[PDB]
Structure formats: C-alpha cells, structure tokens
C-alpha cells in the first residue's frame, strides 16, 4: 500500500531528521511559492491510521478543509508538511506518533502511539 511506499521511498522532512514525517510528491503543484506560517490554507485530504482501521476525508463533508498554517489548529506534521507544498500539489505523508497524537493518542478516534497516513491536495493559500 501507499503507507509502505512512503516508508520505502519517502523524504524525511523533519528538522531533527527523525523520520517522523515522510513525504512523496504524487502530483506537482505550481509556482515557487509555498505557504508561510499564518497563511490561510485550503486542502482536500484523505486520512487513515496506518493500521487502516479508521478513515477520514474532506470529501465526506462536501467542501475543502481550511486551517491557519503553523497555529497548531492541526497536528505538528501537517504544519510541517503542508508548509513544503505548492498550490496544486498532491502529496503523501507518513507520520510518527510524535508529530501526530503522541502516546496519549486521541480516543476514540486515535489510539496511543498511532502512525497516520494522509493524502493531501493543496488547493490554495491566502495571507492573513
Ligand atoms: C482526533 O480528531 C480527529 C482527527 C481527524 C479527523 C477528525 C477528528 O475529530 C475531530 O474528525 C473528522 C474531521 C473533523 O475536522 C476538524 C478536526 C480536526 C482535528 C485535528 O486533526 C488533525 O489535525 C488531522 C489533520 C487535519 C485533518 C484531520 N486530522 C486527523 O488526524 C483526522 C484523523 C486522520 C486519521 C483517521 C482518523 C481521523
């Protein structure tokens, strides 16, 4: 599956180089411009546990998912990963618990120490 592919061939985009967030670009975006901290960000995504046991999509709710980058309205991995993307890019992320929900998890949706997979499309970003 996609999660294994990202383990095999994904780029480690962490500062600490701890393989806690791994990325493959699956479709290239446009521009050199990528979002700065505080940017308003628009994505479609689909997510699961790497176990495959719970699943989640923006599509499910009709409309795009919208958040302020680097304001921890998301897990740290998204702040990190999204910030590396271009308008129009789709990428795959594999995330260790430390850049997601940690040893406390987030029951019942997320268990302790969970690895997460996401597919993310970056639709747009506007400045605060
Ligand atoms: C742990 O809680 C949830 C996690 C996730 C989805 C959830 C959660 O219930 C609140 O509900 C469906 C979407 C509600 O949307 C606004 C909330 C974002 C919560 C913060 O979530 C995150 O930061 C990340 C990244 C942005 C998309 C949502 N994501 C999740 O981890 C998903 C999760 C993905 C893996 C399968 C289970 C759901």
């Amino acid at each position: 599956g996609a999660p294994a592919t990202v383990t095999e061939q994904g780029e480690d985009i962490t500062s600490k180089k701890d393989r806690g967030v791994l990325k493959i670009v699956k479709r290239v975006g446009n521009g050199e411009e990528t979002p700065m901290i505080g940017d308003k960000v628009y994505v479609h995504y689909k997510g699961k546990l790497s176990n495959g046991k719970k699943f989640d999509s923006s599509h499910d709710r009709n409309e795009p998912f919208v958040f302020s980058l680097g304001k921890g309205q998301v897990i740290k991995a998204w702040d990190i990963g999204v910030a590396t993307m271009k308008k129009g890019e789709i990428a795959h992320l594999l995330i260790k618990p430390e850049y997601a929900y940690g040893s406390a998890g987030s029951l019942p949706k997320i268990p302790s120490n969970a690895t997460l997979f996401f597919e993310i499309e970056l639709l747009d970003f506007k400045g605060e």
Side-chain angles (χ1 to χ4, degrees), residues 19-31 34-35:
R19 296 180 50 81
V21 184
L22 295 158
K23 180 187 169 184
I24 312 192
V25 173
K26 295 307 266 179
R27 188 186 68 191
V28 174
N30 310 101
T34 65

Side-chain angles (χ1 to χ4, degrees), residues 6 19-22 50 75 77-78 93-101 113-118 120:
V6 173
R19 296 180 50 81
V21 184
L22 295 158
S50 85
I75 52 172
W78 264 52
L93 294 184
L94 195 64
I95 292 147
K96 286 182 188 172
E98 294 86 352
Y99 296 84
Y101 297 91
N113 278 165
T115 294
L116 308 197
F117 176 84
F118 287 93
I120 302 173

Side-chain angles (χ1 to χ4, degrees), residues 48-49 100-102 104-108 110-116:
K48 55 161 178 182
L49 303 187
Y101 297 91
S106 188
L107 295 177
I110 322 291
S112 170
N113 278 165
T115 294
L116 308 197

